């Protein structure tokens, strides 16, 4: 090496992979694809079949480097296509993901959103070289906790499917905190498995409820381990996420929901200090 260093600023705006003609079916919208540089490549597939290693999903994190261990990471994903549920599990398995967030009811307003990729309760079904059994739901007001048990050679990996059904693609929740109370549980279950790889977040297209959800979570995590007094650059966080998977905070009410999300998490987590007065 040397000072000889190709300063690759924004080394990737690239998106040719999901343009391959073979992936057409593997995408739900034409303009909404994953940056080849942050795209999560399916392993196993044949080096000699067109877009074999493809999925419209991307990795994500504050920035490529920094604090704690490699700070918390997610996978922004596109709601399963019947034609692509077999390989979501390929990436879920392969990414050692152990927690899953699905922020859309399969279908909303007659318009499909995501396609089931889990078996019915007490039942099993295998998606490719993986056999998952839905061990039993836990349905809170705002969500339903499925408890799949995927299997390679029975080597049960337990994954948690948190599905949010109260936050409609046609509009952010009202004066909620159920996505905060929903993000807590999701957060403590991951806070319960270090070996746990990338949490997998997704809606359908994967750049709206998904991207919002992930940004809030990025803000709540930062304030928690750094302080409710530190700087919060939501516009900045957003572009640093869009530099990963463009579009992320897709519509008006959403960008403005990250604000309503944060400010309550901040007061909530600040009246929690009955543990202290700090009134010198």
The tokens of 139 are what?
């349905």
CA distances to 5, 6, 221 from 1, rounded to whole Å, are 8, 11, 36
Q: Is 169 annotated as a binding residue?
A: yes
CA distances to 63, 98, 151, 169, 177 from 132, rounded to whole Å, are 33, 13, 6, 28, 31
The tokens of 21 are what?
């003609």
What CATH number is attached to the domain comprising 188?
3.90.190.10
The tokens of 116 are what?
């089931």
Q: Is 206 annotated as a binding residue?
A: yes
Under a CB-based contact definition with an 8 Å cutoff, are residues 61 and 70 in contact? Answer: yes
Q: Is 60 annotated as a binding residue?
A: no
Q: Is 242 annotated as a binding residue?
A: no
Q: Is 224 helix (H, G, I), strand (E, B) or coil?
A: helix
Q: Is 20 annotated as a binding residue?
A: no
H helices within 126-256, ranges in order? 180-190, 209-226, 234-242, 252-255
Under a CB-based contact definition with an 8 Å cutoff, are residues 130 and 93 in contact? Answer: yes
Residue range of the domain that includes 157: 1-280
Under a CB-based contact definition with an 8 Å cutoff, are residues 202 and 244 in contact? Answer: no
* Cβ count near 175 (within 10 Å): 6
5 by Cβ neighbours in 10 Å (0-12 / 13-18 / 19+) ranks as: exposed
* Cβ count near 73 (within 10 Å): 15
The tokens of 121 are what?
């309760």
Could you tell me which of 11, 2, 6, 17 has the C-alpha nearest to residue 64?
11
Number of domains in the chain: 1
The tokens of 98 are what?
């152990």
Reported as type and span, the H/E element at residue 139 is: strand 138-140
Q: What does 42-105 look like in DSSP terms, one character per residue?
A: PSSS-TTSTTTT--SEEEE-SSSS-STTT---EEEE----GGGSTTHHHHHHHTT--EEEE-S-
CA distance 84 to 42: 12
Q: Is 203 in the active site?
A: yes
Catalytic residue among 80, 114, 203, 230: 203
Which residues have a Cβ under 8 Å from the Cβ of 70 and sit 6 or more positions away?
61
Residue linked to tokens 């302080």: 227
Which residues have a Cβ under 8 Å from the Cβ of 247 and sit 6 or more positions away?
32, 207, 208, 211
How far is C-alpha 239 from the geometric centre of its chain's CA atoms? 17
Q: Is 207 annotated as a binding residue?
A: yes
CA distance 175 to 250: 20
Which residues have a Cβ under 8 Å from the Cβ of 106 and sit 6 or more positions away?
112, 113, 114, 115, 116
Q: Is 5 annotated as a binding residue?
A: no
Residue linked to tokens 């942050």: 38
- Computed on alpha carbons and rounded to an integer, the radius of gyration of the chain in Å comes to 19
Side-chain-facing half-sphere of 196: CA atoms under 13 Å: 23
């Amino acid at each position: 090496f040397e000072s000889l260093q190709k300063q690759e600023v924004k080394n990737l705006h690239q998106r040719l992979e999901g343009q391959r003609p073979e992936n057409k079916g593997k995408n739900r919208y034409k303009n909404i694809l994953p940056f080849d540089h942050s795209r999560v490549i399916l392993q196993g597939r044949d080096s000699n079949i067109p877009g074999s290693d493809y999925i419209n999903a991307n990795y994500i994190k504050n920035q490529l480097l920094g604090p704690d261990e490699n700070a918390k990471t997610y996978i922004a994903s596109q709601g399963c296509l019947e034609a692509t549920v077999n390989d979501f599990w390929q990436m879920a398995w392969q990414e050692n993901s152990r927690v899953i967030v699905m922020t859309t009811r399969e279908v909303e307003k007659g318009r499909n959103k995501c396609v089931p990729y889990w078996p019915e309760v007490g039942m099993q079904r295998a998606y490719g070289p993986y056999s998952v059994t839905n061990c039993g739901e836990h349905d809170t007001t705002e969500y339903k906790l499925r408890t799949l048990q995927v299997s390679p050679g029975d080597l049960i990996r337990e994954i948690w499917h948190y599905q949010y059904l109260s936050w409609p693609d046609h509009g952010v929740p009202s004066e909620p905190g159920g996505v905060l109370s929903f993000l807590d549980q999701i957060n403590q279950r991951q806070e319960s498995l270090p070996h746990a790889g990338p949490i997998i977040v997704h809606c359908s297209a994967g750049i709206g409820r998904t991207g919002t959800i992930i940004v809030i979570d990025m803000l709540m995590e930062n304030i928690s381990t750094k302080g409710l007094d530190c700087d919060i650059d939501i516009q900045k966080t957003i572009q640093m996420v869009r530099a990963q998977r463009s579009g992320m905070v897709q519509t008006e009410a959403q960008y403005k929901f990250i604000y309503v999300a944060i400010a309550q998490f901040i007061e909530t987590t600040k009246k929690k200090l009955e543990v202290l007065q700090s009134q010198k």
